[PDB]
Amino acid sequence: SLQTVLVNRMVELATGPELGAMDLLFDEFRAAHVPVEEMATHYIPEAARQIGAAWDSDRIGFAQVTIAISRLQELLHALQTLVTGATVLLIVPPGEQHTLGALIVAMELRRRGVSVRIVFAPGLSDLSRLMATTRFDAALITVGSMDRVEICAKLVKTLSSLTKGRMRVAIGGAIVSQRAEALARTGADLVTNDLSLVISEFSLV
Ligand code: B12
Ligand SMILES: [Cl-]
Ligand SMILES: [Cl-]
Ligand SMILES: [Cl-]
């Protein structure tokens, strides 16, 4: 019962209208002696999915979703500061608003020994630095919604052009769970949310 009590308290403070929510959440969890890693890698993912399922069933509104995940995003940021050879480039495409999952991915990958650099909406000359050498062993793209899929295909195409097809590109996100075949048009080398498959297929360890 206890783990669901703790998640519900994470969700209740995240969704709640009253301020200071994540400072209060951090105090209560550490007073309960939940360590920082499992706050990061277990509770915040689990509370995020429970918030998502609460929206599926029309029990919380869009703005509650917006404030709760942005708060959990704020908490996850601070926890990863406290607790920390291949390198991947993790790209959040322009106008992609589902961003918590890529933070969870980067911390998972770093824990498995893969260095990650997270970039938001990189242009052609943002990318072109980072592909002019063999600096990154792969690029990773998150995609949350169908209206981002065309922008993701342009990213893969532009990544392919700045390297003549030699940059390996994996795609994950909330789209992959529902409709992974919708990203099969983008020309990525790999469409999965399984990080062990990304790691094995690109040989990142
Ligand atoms: C939270 C959420 C949002 C939040 C985002 C909060 C944030 N800052 O991150 C907000 C409120 C911004 C939001 C709004 C939108 N989103 Co929304 N919302 C959701 C919701 C409820 C949960 C998604 C979530 O956070 N899941 C939990 C996270 C942790 O999982 P994840 O993101 O999938 O990431 C995991 C995996 O995908 C994987 N992973 C992620 N990225 C990558 C990358 C790689 C390379 C790999 C290997 C793995 C990987 O690892 C992660 C952890 O396991 C879902 C519905 C649902 N899923 O139940 C939608 C959903 C994704 N949203 C959707 C939509 C449509 C939107 C909007 C684009 C438009 C709209 N009409 O709402 C807007 C954004 C633009 C706008 N505002 O106009 C749709 C997408 C389907 C579609 N397009 O038809 C969904 C599915 C809801 C729905 N059924 O309508 N959303
Ligand atoms: Cl601490
Ligand atoms: Cl939504
Ligand atoms: Cl980290």
Residue numbers in the entry: 0 to 83, 92 to 212
Q: What do the authors of the reporting publication say about this deposited model?
A:
Recently, CrtJ’s activity was shown to be modulated by two size variants of a B12 binding co-regulator called SAerR and LAerR in Rhodobacter capsulatus.
In this study, we solved the crystal structure of R. capsulatus SAerR at a 2.25 Å resolution. The solved crystal structure of SAerR containing bound cobalamin has a four-helix bundle cap followed by an α/β Rossman fold. B12 is nestled between the four-helix bundle cap on the left and the Rossman fold on the right. The corrin ring is anchored in place by His145 in the Rossman fold that functions as the lower ligand to the Co in cobalamin. SAerR crystals were grown in a high concentration of NaCl, so Cl appears to have replaced the upper ligand –OH that was originally present in hydroxycobalamin that was light-attached to SAerR. Analysis of the region near the upper Cl axial ligand shows that it is protected by two aromatic residues, Trp94 and Phe101, in SAerR.
